[PDB]
Amino acid sequence: SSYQIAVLAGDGIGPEVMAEARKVLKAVEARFGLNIEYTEYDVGGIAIDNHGCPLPEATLKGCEAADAILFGSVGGPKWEKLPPNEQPERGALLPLRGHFELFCNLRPAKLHDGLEHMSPLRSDISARGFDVLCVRELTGGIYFGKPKGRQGEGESEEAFDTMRYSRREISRIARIAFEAARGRRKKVTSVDKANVLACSVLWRQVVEEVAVDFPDVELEHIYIDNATMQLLRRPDEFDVMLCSNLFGDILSDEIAMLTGSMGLLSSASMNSTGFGLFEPAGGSAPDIAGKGIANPIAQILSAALMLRHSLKQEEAASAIERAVTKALNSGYLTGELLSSDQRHKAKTTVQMGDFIADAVKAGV
Amino acid sequence: SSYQIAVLAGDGIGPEVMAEARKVLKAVEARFGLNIEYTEYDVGGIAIDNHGCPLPEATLKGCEAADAILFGSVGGPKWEKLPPNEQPERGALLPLRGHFELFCNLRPAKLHDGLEHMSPLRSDISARGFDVLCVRELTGGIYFGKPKGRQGEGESEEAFDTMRYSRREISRIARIAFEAARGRRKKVTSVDKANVLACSVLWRQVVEEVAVDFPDVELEHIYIDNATMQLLRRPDEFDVMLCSNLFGDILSDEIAMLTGSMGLLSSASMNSTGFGLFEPAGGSAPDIAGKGIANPIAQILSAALMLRHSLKQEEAASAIERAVTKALNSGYLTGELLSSDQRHKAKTTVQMGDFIADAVKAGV
Ligand SMILES: CC(C)[C@H](C(=O)O)[C@@H](O)C(=O)O
Ligand SMILES: CC(C)[C@H](C(=O)O)[C@@H](O)C(=O)O
Ligand SMILES: [Ca+2]
Ligand SMILES: [Ca+2]
Ligand SMILES: [Cl-]
Ligand SMILES: [Cl-]
């Protein structure tokens, strides 16, 4: 019977790009004989406007009833004066992650053929290409560790957050990184700050214990400050980067920015049952919303990760990936992927969804 | 009477570049009539070899007896198998910082005229130039917060580090950033993760309280993951970046790497009495040590920050800065600042110290 998907398109460009992800999914549903039912729920800014909070009860219960969450983007100027902590992004994403135990965040980033000039890296570096998958631990560390809070008053008033990791937490995420390296270029670089943090000393030690199960995979360790530097110089020498919550937050965004093409990048945040939340790497771009300008490929590839990882539909996932590839190499680019002089060749969001869905239909 | 400087040259290239910083200081001592006495102490790898630990008692007591510490670089392959936490870098630097309450870290980084091609940024971005001063809080946050440690065993064994900040700690570092912005381009960008961390919510709130004393300075806030991205795209729009310990560690290194010329970058770590520890931004480069290849400018500019900030000798500090400028614009570059084809023009470490010291003598 039917898969059930909770669709949480959110704010800004979220709904208009979600529309295209749904159009391409309809083509993959027809092509592979999948029965998938979708229910839309508010989340983020639209949920604060419609329901008074960024993650309404009904939305959370709809996600509980689903096989996966296909998530858009949340946030925008309009809610940007609420405390940073009643704000829509953090208020949608952290409770979804904590509630469904979404410990694994996978962010594949690569420099696509022919779009090297868009990367902010000097041309000889982006010409080498890169393909880095960031595996970030998402439900532990300093994000959800306790005690967190503040005490005291005046000058001596103090706040505190505790970064905490157990061997169990590190070993589950490290295994995912090694398993992913096995299928790629067989190297895991584990990123930590083991010269300062007890958490990272335990991190490094556990990742080395996990490595015994992967003698075909090379493991190196690097400090987060050195990784931030080395991704600027030699990103082509990394394969799978394995990070705790706070380090992976920073490094996965640094690598996304280094592609120069965030409109192509998606994200999977999964638990150990295979339920996940699938979203584009980029934000809600509220200034271009409503104009048919936004690149829907990130939301479309989010749907492909959802099919692969939550729905175990590998053929359907790869048909969407290939249909994206076909767009990128057949002159179907949106404006932000085009150099300043080629920009009159830009396709709109709908034209991109039509092309990719048609390519799925045509059997790409 | 005499200033007293503890000289802790450390490992790798540290001594050979320190030799040049001392040669240039001798020229500034003659030119400005300063009486400065220097005593050398082991620290880092050389201290572990000679004394069994990276920060011997006698070294720490020599720094207590000094007006400033002129520090080289620590670390190298040879000690890289000790626990990451008996290791020379962390074992020299964190106790010096904690012991002398060196709360303020200043790392000025700029793209120098004529060396834009060396930056790993695409050519149109490095052509715009940048000049970012990172002000990092160095004695609080998660580096020295307690409880830190681990408990338990097997799968449930857990480690923890606590990030802690008081208003007093934030306000002292924020004032330094605002005061520095006042003398530069009048903008402070405060970097935090206020959407997740209680510490950063208090950070943001206190920096906004401090801002009332600087109505001429613009304050913006940015999340660390977004700052890591925005420095790749528009580093020319930042002036003073204001960070807690762990965020400033990452961002100051990202910005150093983005210049492409770490051999030119120095660092000041100071307490509120004006005692500081002055060191190059880069590491001990143990593979080029002993060969006369290393660029001594970073250690030389460290001496200039030492004269300015610890010894209140502004004229002497600026004469060294100008003498460096003169080298860079008179064809005195070391090999790593030269493109692959111009590399036969490379000056050696001694030739660079001779030139800069002679320029100080000549009245630059
Ligand atoms: C909104 C924020 C809590 C979140 C995080 O830090 O994880 C976001 O930056 C991300 O990367 O998903
Ligand atoms: C060696 C390490 C403890 C240190 C730090 O993290 O501060 C270093 O990375 C630095 O930036 O001075
Ligand atoms: Ca992020
Ligand atoms: Ca560092
Ligand atoms: Cl963390
Ligand atoms: Cl910190």
The CATH number assigned to the domain holding A358 equals 3.40.718.10
Is residue A234 helix, strand or coil?
Answer: coil
Q: Which residues sit opposite B110 in a β-bridge?
A: B131
Q: Which residues sit opposite A110 in a β-bridge?
A: A131
Among residues A243, A347, A253, A353, the alpha carbon closest in space to that of A301 is found at: A353
Contact B281, B108 (CB under 8 A): no
> Which chain B positions have a beta carbon within 8 Å of A125's beta carbon?
120
As a three-state string, the secondary structure of chain B is CCEEEEEEEECCCHHHHHHHHHHHHHHHHHHHCCCEEEEECCCCHHHHHHHCCCCCHHHHHHHHCCCEEEEEECCCHHHCCCCCCCCHHHHHHHHHHHHCCCCEEEEEEECCCCCHHHCCECHHHHHHCCEEEEEEECCCHHHHCCCCEEECCHHHCEEEEEEEEEHHHHHHHHHHHHHHHHCCCCEEEEEECCCCCHHHHHHHHHHHHHHHHCCCCEEEEEEHHHHHHHHHHCHHHCCEEEECHHHHHHHHHHHHHHHCCHHHCEEEEECCCCCEEEEECCCCCHHHCCCCCCCCHHHHHHHHHHHHHCCCCHHHHHHHHHHHHHHHHCCCCCHHHCCCCCHHHCCCHHHHHHHHHHHHHCCC
Is residue A323 within a helix (H) or strand (E), and if so which, with residue range?
A: helix A314-329
Which residue from B minimizes the CA distance to A225? Answer: B250
Distance B250 CA to ligand 2 centre (A): 9
Residue numbers of A annotated as active site: 143, 193, 225, 249, 253
Contact B26, B320 (CB under 8 A): no
As a three-state string, the secondary structure of B154-209 is HHHCEEEEEEEEEHHHHHHHHHHHHHHHHCCCCEEEEEECCCCCHHHHHHHHHHHH
As a three-state string, the secondary structure of A84-106 is CCCCHHHHHHHHHHHHCCCCEEE
Contact B69, B96 (CB under 8 A): yes
| Cα angle: A146, vertex A152, A156; to 5 degrees | 110
Q: What are phi and psi of B206, to 5 degrees?
A: -70, -40
Torsion of CA A234, A238, A242, A246, to 10 degrees: 20
Q: Chain B contact for A52, CB < 8 A?
A: no
- State how far Cα B35 lies from the chain centre: 25
Contact A74, A285 (CB under 8 A): no
Q: Chain A contact for B125, CB < 8 A?
A: yes
- Which residues make Cβ contacts (< 8 Å) with residue B136, sequence separation at least 6? B104, B105, B107, B173, B243, B244, B245, B247, B248, B249, B251, B252
Residue at A209: amino acid letter:
E
Give the whole-angstrom CA distance, residue B124 versus residue A246: 31
Return the DSSP state at A27.
H
Q: Is the CA virtual torsion A332, A334, A337, A339 positive or negative?
A: positive
Contact check, Cβ <8 Å, B232/A198? no
A4: left (phi over 0), alpha (psi -120 to 50) or beta: beta
Interface mutation target, options B148, B162, B237, chain A, most CBs of A under 10 Å: B162
Return the DSSP state at A347.
P
Among residues A116, A241, A260, A170, the alpha carbon closest in space to that of B155 is found at: A170
Q: Which residues sit opposite B320 in a β-bridge?
A: none
User: Other C-beta atoms within 10 Å of B354: how many?
Assistant: 16
Q: How many domains does chain B have?
A: 1
For chains A and B, count residue pairs whose Cβ atoms are closer than 8 Å: 191
Q: Chain A contact for B362, CB < 8 A?
A: no
Give the whole-angstrom CA distance, residue A165 versus residue A192: 12
Give the whole-angstrom CA distance, residue B113 versus residue B115: 6
- State how far Cα A17 lies from the chain centre: 15
- State how far Cα A41 lies from the chain centre: 20
Residue at B232: amino acid letter:
L
Question: Checking DSSP bridges between strand B266-270 and strand B104-110, what pairing results, if any?
Answer: antiparallel
Q: Is the CA virtual torsion A328, A330, A336, A341 positive or negative?
A: positive
Give the whole-angstrom CA distance, residue B284 versus residue B10: 8
**What is the nearest CA distance from A236 to chain B, expressed in angstroms?**
14
Give the whole-angstrom CA distance, residue A78 versus residue B194: 18
Give the whole-angstrom CA distance, residue A99 versus residue B162: 24
Give the whole-angstrom CA distance, residue B299 versus residue B317: 13
Give the whole-angstrom CA distance, residue A161 versus residue A174: 24
B239 annotated as a binding-site residue: no
> Which chain B positions have a beta carbon within 8 Å of A241's beta carbon?
none
Contact B190, B207 (CB under 8 A): yes
Cis peptide bond prior to B147, omega within 30° of 0: yes
Its domain, for residue B265, covers: 1-364
| Experiment used for this model | X-ray
Q: Which residues sit opposite B158 in a β-bridge?
A: A166, B151
A68-73, strands of its sheet edge to edge = A36-40, A3-10, A68-73, A276-280, A266-270, A104-110, A131-137, A240-243, A187-192, A218-223
What separation in angstroms does the CA of B45 have from each of A178, B9, B40, B54?
33, 11, 15, 6
Contact check, Cβ <8 Å, A121/B120? yes
What separation in angstroms does the CA of B268 have from each of A360, B35, B97, B281, B316?
58, 22, 11, 9, 16
A253 annotated as a binding-site residue: yes
Is residue A340 helix, strand or coil?
Answer: coil
Give the whole-angstrom CA distance, residue B224 versus residue B247: 7
Contact A319, A313 (CB under 8 A): no
**What is the nearest CA distance from A263 to chain B, expressed in angstroms?**
15
Q: What are phi and psi of A237, to 5 degrees?
A: -90, 0
A82 annotated as a binding-site residue: yes
Give the whole-angstrom CA distance, residue B120 versus residue B118: 6
> Which chain A positions have a beta carbon within 8 Å of B157's beta carbon?
166-167, 202
Give the whole-angstrom CA distance, residue A60 versus residue A65: 9
Q: Chain A contact for B150, CB < 8 A?
A: yes
Between helix A224-233 and helix B245-259 the angle, nearest 10°, is: 20
Q: What is the CA radius of gyration of chain A?
A: 20
What separation in angstroms does the CA of B16 have from each of A179, B10, B97, B284?
46, 10, 24, 10
B9 annotated as a binding-site residue: no
What separation in angstroms does the CA of B221 have from each of A103, B172, B188, B233, B243?
29, 18, 8, 17, 10
Question: Checking DSSP bridges between strand A266-270 and strand A104-110, what pairing results, if any?
Answer: antiparallel
B158-166, strands of its sheet edge to edge = A149-151, A158-166, B158-166, B149-151
